[PDB]
Amino acid sequence: DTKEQRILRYVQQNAKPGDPQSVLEAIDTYCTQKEWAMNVGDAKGQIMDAVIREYSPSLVLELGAYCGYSAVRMARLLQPGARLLTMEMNPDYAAITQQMLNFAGLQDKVTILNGASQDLIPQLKKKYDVDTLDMVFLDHWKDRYLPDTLLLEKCGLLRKGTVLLADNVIVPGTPDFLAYVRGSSSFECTHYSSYLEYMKVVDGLEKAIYQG
Ligand SMILES: Nc1ncnc2c1ncn2[C@@H]1O[C@H](CSCC[C@H](N)C(=O)O)[C@@H](O)[C@H]1O
Ligand SMILES: Cc1ccc(S(=O)(=O)c2cc(F)c(O)c3ncccc23)cc1
Ligand SMILES: [Mg+2]
């Protein structure tokens, strides 16, 4: 029995099936009252929601799924026919994420890509018929934000206006990524100050819009 299975179980026992909002509130309740967990959370999740509604992306890439909280957060706001692809290298986690998506009724919109982003990113065009990405949610290991950003650009997956949205740019921090995008003329950056999931530690999201 893992913490991730206990979270999935609490959702199955308490959330309304096919109701993504109630799945979200159930994860946040369990992690606020019983076990902290690295979901993006409700405070940063609300900023995510606002960014998603602004840009209405047709194709979203997520780096790091964990238990599916953030994929459920974004997919429930996608237009009909919009797609989310989420890369997760831990097979236990990816199996929890698939079950969470199934319970929320979002299976049709989300495709789990089992593996490490650095291996899966060069296969996006061929194996998933991707031209360019409309939005990227970066929320995996912090030492990969900058390498995977450089890899996305190298593989031709970015276009003018592609929205990169990065979690944890303050805590635990992504200093090289943050320095890179803020100093690069290829990105227009905005910082959204918030709080670490289920805590009052300051954290924030960085939005970095590729400029071509
Ligand atoms: N190189 C990589 N490729 C794919 N997944 C990765 C990765 N490095 C870390 N991960 C995964 O990144 C996840 C970070 S936690 C992600 C939480 C999720 N975005 C949410 O907000 O609910 C972990 O599950 C870890 O296994
Ligand atoms: C098992 C485990 C627990 C905590 C951490 S972590 O690096 O502390 C961390 C904290 C956090 F708030 C986040 O949102 C995170 N998102 C993505 C990856 C790490 C995150 C890594 C692994
Ligand atoms: Mg995070």
XYZ file of C-alpha atoms and ligand atoms in Angstrom:
261
model
C 0.000 0.000 0.000
C 1.462 3.319 -1.228
C 0.414 6.894 -0.568
C -0.654 7.126 -4.223
C -2.966 4.101 -3.887
C -4.414 5.560 -0.684
C -5.162 8.771 -2.599
C -6.846 6.890 -5.458
C -8.870 4.862 -2.942
C -10.048 8.000 -1.152
C -11.197 9.428 -4.489
C -13.065 6.224 -5.426
C -14.712 6.161 -1.992
C -15.625 9.850 -1.777
C -15.710 11.538 -5.182
C -18.618 11.589 -7.602
C -17.752 9.455 -10.661
C -17.379 11.368 -13.928
C -17.246 14.637 -11.951
C -13.740 16.161 -12.347
C -14.364 18.955 -9.849
C -15.276 16.472 -7.111
C -12.225 14.333 -7.928
C -10.089 17.481 -7.491
C -11.718 18.481 -4.202
C -11.323 14.902 -2.929
C -7.570 14.784 -3.630
C -7.108 18.213 -2.040
C -9.095 17.166 1.043
C -7.108 13.961 1.585
C -3.755 15.727 1.130
C -4.797 18.614 3.421
C -6.073 16.339 6.208
C -4.036 13.111 6.035
C -0.930 13.027 3.783
C 0.827 15.862 1.963
C 1.514 15.038 -1.692
C 3.079 16.823 -4.651
C -0.114 17.720 -6.550
C -0.048 21.243 -7.972
C -2.883 21.953 -5.536
C -5.884 24.246 -5.502
C -4.159 27.639 -4.990
C -1.813 27.196 -7.945
C -4.494 25.132 -9.682
C -6.789 28.182 -9.769
C -4.084 30.162 -11.569
C -3.664 27.226 -13.975
C -7.426 27.263 -14.632
C -7.267 31.004 -15.429
C -4.326 30.551 -17.843
C -6.060 27.601 -19.573
C -9.299 29.558 -20.075
C -7.350 32.511 -21.476
C -5.514 30.512 -24.181
C -7.990 27.639 -24.894
C -5.172 25.313 -26.051
C -6.057 22.538 -28.480
C -2.975 20.438 -27.630
C -1.383 20.467 -24.165
C 1.773 18.621 -23.086
C 2.244 17.834 -19.390
C 5.641 16.853 -17.967
C 4.971 14.858 -14.798
C 1.549 13.347 -14.022
C 2.029 11.706 -10.595
C -1.551 10.849 -9.546
C -3.330 12.786 -12.326
C -4.444 15.813 -10.283
C -3.077 18.421 -12.702
C -4.136 16.423 -15.777
C -7.673 16.253 -14.383
C -7.419 19.979 -13.618
C -6.488 20.919 -17.196
C -8.446 18.307 -19.190
C -11.772 19.237 -17.562
C -11.309 22.738 -19.055
C -10.322 21.733 -22.593
C -12.672 22.450 -25.495
C -14.354 19.474 -27.206
C -11.735 17.709 -29.304
C -8.803 19.243 -27.424
C -6.090 16.839 -26.265
C -3.763 16.555 -23.267
C -0.682 14.325 -23.422
C 1.079 13.614 -20.124
C 4.521 12.040 -19.707
C 5.205 10.015 -16.535
C 8.281 7.823 -16.038
C 7.128 6.021 -12.877
C 4.847 3.099 -13.934
C 3.182 2.880 -10.524
C 2.296 6.578 -10.759
C 1.171 6.317 -14.396
C -1.192 3.490 -13.475
C -2.658 5.571 -10.643
C -3.051 8.479 -13.097
C -4.900 6.339 -15.658
C -7.294 5.126 -12.960
C -7.837 8.696 -11.743
C -8.600 9.859 -15.296
C -10.994 6.924 -15.773
C -12.880 7.802 -12.587
C -13.167 11.463 -13.575
C -14.529 10.629 -17.038
C -11.588 12.256 -18.791
C -10.014 9.125 -20.352
C -11.020 10.198 -23.864
C -9.132 13.509 -23.632
C -5.868 12.420 -21.918
C -3.181 10.126 -23.294
C -0.609 8.847 -20.831
C 2.893 8.527 -22.266
C 4.849 6.053 -20.129
C 8.502 7.004 -19.949
C 10.983 9.814 -19.392
C 10.297 13.115 -21.141
C 13.812 13.239 -22.605
C 13.137 9.931 -24.394
C 9.480 10.558 -25.275
C 9.745 14.159 -26.518
C 11.601 13.301 -29.780
C 8.847 10.757 -30.588
C 5.868 13.113 -30.228
C 5.607 14.032 -33.903
C 5.889 10.489 -35.270
C 3.963 8.433 -32.702
C 1.270 10.928 -31.709
C 0.783 13.146 -34.814
C 1.858 16.394 -33.217
C 2.789 19.445 -35.217
C 3.441 22.047 -32.498
C 2.234 22.356 -28.909
C -0.173 25.072 -27.756
C 0.711 24.765 -24.097
C 3.240 22.915 -21.919
C 2.853 22.277 -18.193
C 6.287 21.570 -16.648
C 6.058 19.839 -13.288
C 8.574 16.982 -13.242
C 12.109 16.950 -11.768
C 13.395 20.491 -11.596
C 16.767 19.759 -13.192
C 14.889 18.831 -16.404
C 12.890 22.034 -16.990
C 15.697 23.715 -18.943
C 16.976 20.597 -20.835
C 13.424 19.598 -21.868
C 12.665 23.172 -22.970
C 15.764 23.100 -25.175
C 14.720 19.646 -26.426
C 11.167 20.802 -27.274
C 12.593 23.680 -29.321
C 15.136 21.404 -31.024
C 12.385 18.952 -32.058
C 10.303 21.730 -33.647
C 7.480 21.367 -31.110
C 7.295 25.059 -30.183
C 5.664 27.845 -32.188
C 5.107 31.574 -31.732
C 2.675 31.849 -28.809
C 3.295 28.391 -27.316
C 2.605 28.858 -23.606
C 5.067 27.218 -21.210
C 3.709 27.175 -17.669
C 6.202 26.051 -15.005
C 5.393 24.918 -11.465
C 7.709 25.212 -8.457
C 9.875 28.019 -9.809
C 10.442 29.232 -6.215
C 10.079 26.029 -4.150
C 11.894 23.784 -4.575
C 13.035 26.089 -7.379
C 14.181 25.829 -11.009
C 16.927 28.470 -11.062
C 18.632 27.675 -14.388
C 15.283 27.370 -16.234
C 14.014 30.589 -14.669
C 17.239 32.463 -15.463
C 17.193 31.058 -18.994
C 13.659 32.060 -20.039
C 13.701 35.482 -18.334
C 16.972 36.398 -20.032
C 16.164 34.931 -23.433
C 14.539 37.098 -26.051
C 12.754 33.965 -27.303
C 10.408 34.040 -24.290
C 8.046 36.603 -22.760
C 7.749 35.769 -19.072
C 5.190 36.482 -16.362
C 5.390 35.394 -12.725
C 2.258 34.321 -10.790
C 3.017 34.321 -7.085
C 1.118 31.740 -5.037
C 1.707 29.075 -2.363
C 3.079 25.550 -2.265
C 0.303 22.952 -2.425
C -1.449 22.475 0.941
C 1.027 24.870 2.658
C 1.701 28.579 3.207
C 5.231 28.488 1.800
C 5.520 30.992 -1.041
C 5.847 29.410 -4.482
C 4.861 30.552 -7.942
C 4.197 29.632 -11.531
C 6.171 31.109 -14.406
C 4.471 31.616 -17.749
C 7.007 31.742 -20.577
C 5.570 32.376 -24.039
C 7.834 31.264 -26.853
C 8.337 34.131 -29.288
C 9.747 32.145 -32.205
N 11.999 13.006 -16.915
C 10.701 12.714 -16.505
N 9.803 12.273 -17.423
C 8.541 11.988 -17.021
N 8.028 12.079 -15.779
C 8.950 12.516 -14.915
C 10.270 12.852 -15.186
N 10.896 13.265 -14.036
C 9.987 13.182 -13.083
N 8.792 12.720 -13.575
C 7.590 12.575 -12.785
O 7.239 13.922 -12.443
C 6.258 13.821 -11.395
C 6.407 15.040 -10.531
S 4.910 15.258 -9.548
C 3.744 15.863 -10.805
C 2.426 16.280 -10.163
C 1.348 16.641 -11.187
N 1.852 17.563 -12.241
C 0.216 17.293 -10.421
O 0.319 18.546 -10.352
O -0.678 16.515 -9.986
C 6.583 12.523 -10.641
O 5.468 11.651 -10.794
C 7.780 11.961 -11.412
O 7.719 10.547 -11.573
C 8.366 12.029 -3.744
C 8.717 13.476 -3.899
C 8.213 14.427 -3.007
C 8.546 15.777 -3.151
C 9.385 16.134 -4.212
S 9.803 17.840 -4.403
O 10.857 17.910 -5.398
O 9.930 18.326 -3.038
C 8.355 18.611 -5.117
C 7.620 19.464 -4.300
C 6.493 20.079 -4.832
F 5.792 20.892 -4.041
C 6.095 19.858 -6.156
O 4.960 20.485 -6.653
C 6.819 19.007 -6.991
N 6.411 18.813 -8.263
C 7.136 17.974 -9.042
C 8.270 17.314 -8.607
C 8.693 17.516 -7.298
C 7.970 18.372 -6.455
C 9.902 15.208 -5.121
C 9.556 13.869 -4.947
Mg 4.860 20.588 -8.738
